[PDB]
Design brief:
Chains A, B: Forms homodimers via its C-terminal domain. Component of the get4/get5/sgt2 sorting complex. Binds directly sgt12 homodimers. Chains A, B: It is found in: Cytoplasm. Chains A, B: This is Golgi to ER traffic protein 5. Chains A, B: It comes from Aspergillus fumigatus (strain ATCC MYA-4609 / CBS 101355 / FGSC A1100 / Af293) (Neosartorya fumigata). Two copies of one chain form a homodimer. Chain A is built from two helices and no strands. In chain A, helix 1 packs across helix 2. The interface between A and B is medium-sized, with 26 and 26 residues.
């Protein structure tokens, strides 16, 4: 992986939010960041 | 943690990029995303 196709996966963002949940201790906030970061990644194109 | 003060830490973003490195298998790409996502988080304010 060069680092893109995996980022384009729901699995990536699920685990990404999983990490966010671990650190932030908040599902909803981690969810907000999952979306925000994914949209930022979308703007990376 | 409500999910913000930890996100405001370099440690958070370091581990965040660590996760990105694990999945993406690329330090530079993971770094790009660390910055991008952090700037997105900045725009969350």
């Amino acid at each position: 992986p060069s680092g893109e196709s995996v980022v384009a996966t729901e699995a990536f963002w699920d685990d990404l939010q999983g990490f966010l949940e671990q650190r932030l201790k908040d599902y909803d906030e981690a969810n907000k960041l999952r979306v925000l970061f994914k949209e930022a990644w979308r703007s990376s194109f």
